[PDB]
Design a binder for this molecule. Structure first.
Ligand SMILES: *[C@@H]1O[C@H](CO)[C@@H](O)[C@H](O)[C@H]1NC(C)=O
Ligand SMILES: NC1=NCc2ccccc21
Ligand SMILES: NC1=NCc2ccccc21
Ligand SMILES: NC1=NCc2ccccc21
Ligand SMILES: [Ca+2]
Ligand SMILES: [Ca+2]
Ligand SMILES: [Ca+2]
Ligand SMILES: [Cl-]
Ligand code: NA
Ligand code: NA
Ligand code: NA
Ligand code: NA
Length: 472
C-alpha cells in the first residue's frame, strides 16, 4: 500500500501519525478499504460541491438545499465566511486523495453530499426533511448541531425529527437502518452535560466526543453517559487541529471542536460499511463498543464496567480504531432483533429534598419475548419537579455495579421546569446482564434548601438474549 501524496497529508496527524496517537486509518486503507460504494451526507450549512478536493467525490443524490427548497446545497457566500462549516466537515470524510490538493478524507473514495439546512430558520420540519433525505441512497449522515450549548437548555427532536429517526433506523438503507453520526456538543465552557441534548442522547445516533492531540479532554467537551466513542480534534494552541477543505476552494489547518470529530467518525464508519455492507445500525454501534481504545486518553473517570470494558463520560469507550473496525466487521454476525423491556419503577411519588435514592430489583422481562440478558442502551425516563434544575446531579447504577452519571450539576441552569419524561440514556452498561438491583440517585449539589418531587421513573432496557462474548 502507498499512502497518499497530498501536500497536507503529513499535517493530518490524526491519520498519518507514526507515534500511535492516531485513528489507525492507514491500517484500514492497507486492508483495501477506502470507502468505495459508500454514500455520506453532511447535514450542515451547505457544501462547496465544486471544491477542487470534493468535486471528484461529490454526489448530488446525497445532497439537497432544505433552507431554500432546491437540489443545490451550494453555500451562501458572505464576507465573514459564515457558511464554511459543511465544506470543512465534508472534506474530513471524503476529500479526494492523491490529487495534489490539501489532504485526504478518511474515506477518500466514498461519495459525499451535503444538506444545506442550518442557514435559515431550523424548524422541526427542516430537521426531519434533512434526516430523511434519500434514505435508500445515503448510508451515513453526519450532524454537528443541536440545542444551544449554553448549559441551561434541555431540548431534543420534536415530533417530525423523532419520526425521521425512527423511520431511518427502521426502513432506511434497505431495512438495515440509516447510520446517524452525531457530535456530542461544544458546551464545555458552560459546564454543559450532553444528556440534556436529545439528539446526542438518542439511541438512534452514534454520538462522538473529542480528544486533544496530547490525549486530554478539550475545553469545549461535554461529558455524558450517552456518548459512545471519541475521535481527535483541537485543543490548546500548542496542539494541532483538523486539516480539511475550506470555503472558496481553500485548505484549512484550523478546523475545531466536537463538530470536527463527528465527520471523522462518519468516515471511519464508511470504511467499516465497505467491509460489510450488511451491518445494521445496531451492529455498527456494537462494533464501536468492541473496538474503541481508551489507551493514552486522560480522564479522571475511567471505570471498568461489568463486562470488563473501560468507559469514561468524556470519551465513551475511547478512540475509534479504523483498522480494528474494518477487521471485526468482515465476519460479523448480525445481532438478534432488538428487544425493549419497560419497567415502571415507582409506586408513589418521592420527595427529592437534599438527596433521594430509589432501589429496585428487576427481572428484565423474564419469561417474556422482550427478556433481555445482553443490554445495549438503557434509559431512566424521569419526570420530576425541582426549584433549580442545575443543582441536581443524577446517577444510575446497574446490577453489575456500573455507575452512570445521567446528569451532572449545571451551574447556569436556573430552570424551575424540571424534567418531563426525559429519557436520560447510558451506553456504559452495554453487554451487561440487566437483571438484579438498579439504583437511581438524585442529589442536590448545592447548599441551598432546594425542593421537588420525583413522580415517574421508567427504566427502559434495550438489548437481546443471545450471543455474549467472554468479558474482556
Ligand atoms: C444480511 O444479514 C441477514 C440477517 O442475518 C441475512 O438474512 C442476509 O442473508 C444477509 N445478507 C447478505 C447479503 O449477507
Ligand atoms: N450536539 C450539539 N448540540 C449543539 C452543538 C453544536 C456543535 C456541535 C454539536 C452540538
Ligand atoms: N434543534 C435545535 N435547537 C437549536 C438549534 C440550532 C441549530 C439547529 C438545530 C437546533
Ligand atoms: N414522536 C412524538 N413526539 C411528540 C408526539 C406526540 C404524539 C405522537 C408522537 C409524538
Ligand atoms: Ca440552493
Ligand atoms: Ca486531496
Ligand atoms: Ca450541549
Ligand atoms: Cl422504542
Ligand atoms: Na426541540
Ligand atoms: Na446518541
Ligand atoms: Na465496575
Ligand atoms: Na443480575
Amino acid at each position: 500500500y502507498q499512502e497518499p501524496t497530498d501536500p497536507k497529508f503529513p499535517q493530518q496527524w490524526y491519520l498519518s501519525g507514526v507515534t500511535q496517537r492516531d485513528l489507525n486509518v492507514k491500517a484500514a486503507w492497507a486492508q483495501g478499504y477506502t470507502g468505495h460504494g459508500i454514500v455520506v451526507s453532511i447535514l450542515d450549512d451547505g457544501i462547496e460541491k465544486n471544491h477542487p478536493d470534493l468535486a471528484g467525490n461529490y454526489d448530488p443524490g446525497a445532497s439537497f438545499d432544505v433552507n431554500d427548497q432546491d437540489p443545490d446545497p451550494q453555500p451562501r457566500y458572505t464576507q465573514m465566511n459564515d457558511n464554511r462549516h459543511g465544506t470543512r466537515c465534508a472534506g474530513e470524510v471524503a476529500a479526494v486523495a492523491n490529487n495534489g490538493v490539501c489532504g485526504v478524507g478518511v474515506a477518500y473514495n466514498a461519495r459525499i453530499g451535503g444538506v444545506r439546512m442550518l442557514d435559515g430558520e431550523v424548524t422541526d420540519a427542516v430537521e426531519a426533511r434533512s434526516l430523511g433525505l434519500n434514505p435508500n441512497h445515503i448510508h451515513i449522515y453526519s450532524a454537528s448541531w443541536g440545542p444551544e450549548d449554553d448549559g441551561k437548555t434541555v431540548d431534543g427532536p420534536a415530533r417530525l425529527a423523532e419520526e425521521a429517526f425512527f423511520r431511518g433506523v427502521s426502513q432506511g438503507r434497505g431495512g438495515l437502518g440509516s447510520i446517524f453520526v452525531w457530535a456530542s456538543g461544544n458546551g464545555g465552557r458552560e459546564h454543559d452535560s450532553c444528556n440534556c441534548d436529545g439528539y446526542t442522547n438518542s439511541i438512534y445516533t452514534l454520538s462522538i466526543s473529542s480528544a486533544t492531540q496530547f490525549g486530554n479532554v478539550p475545553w469545549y467537551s461535554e461529558a455524558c453517559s450517552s456518548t459512545l466513542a471519541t475521535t481527535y480534534s483541537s485543543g490548546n494552541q500548542n496542539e494541532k487541529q483538523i486539516v480539511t477543505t475550506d470555503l472558496r476552494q481553500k485548505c484549512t489547518e484550523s478546523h475545531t471542536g466536537t463538530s470536527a470529530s463527528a465527520p471523522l467518525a462518519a468516515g471511519i464508519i464508511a470504511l467499516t460499511l465497505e467491509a460489510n455492507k450488511n451491518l445494521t445500525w445496531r451492529d455498527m454501534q456494537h462494533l464501536v463498543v468492541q473496538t474503541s481504545k481508551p489507551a493514552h486518553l486522560n480522564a479522571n473517570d475511567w471505570a471498568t464496567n461489568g463486562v470488563g470494558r473501560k468507559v469514561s463520560h468524556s470519551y465513551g469507550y475511547g478512540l475509534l480504531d479504523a483498522g480494528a473496525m474494518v477487521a471485526l466487521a468482515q465476519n460479523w454476525t448480525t445481532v438478534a432483533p432488538q428487544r425493549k423491556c419497560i419497567i415502571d419503577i415507582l409506586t408513589e411519588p418521592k420527595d427529592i429534598g437534599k438527596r433521594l435514592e430509589v432501589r429496585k430489583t428487576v427481572t428484565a422481562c423474564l419469561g417474556e419475548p422482550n427478556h433481555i440478558t445482553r443490554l445495549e442502551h438503557a434509559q431512566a425516563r424521569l419526570t420530576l419537579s425541582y426549584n433549580r434544575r442545575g443543582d441536581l446531579a443524577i446517577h444510575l447504577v446497574s446490577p453489575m455495579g456500573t455507575r452512570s452519571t445521567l446528569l451532572a450539576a449545571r451551574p447556569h441552569d436556573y430552570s424551575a421546569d424540571g424534567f418531563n419524561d426525559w429519557a436520560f440514556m447510558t451506553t456504559h452498561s452495554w453487554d451487561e446482564d440487566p437483571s438484579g438491583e438498579w439504583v437511581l440517585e438524585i442529589e442536590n449539589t448545592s447548599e441551598a434548601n432546594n425542593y421537588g418531587t420525583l413522580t415517574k421513573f421508567t427504566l427502559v432496557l434495550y438489548g437481546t438474549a443471545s450471543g455474549s462474548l467472554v468479558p474482556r
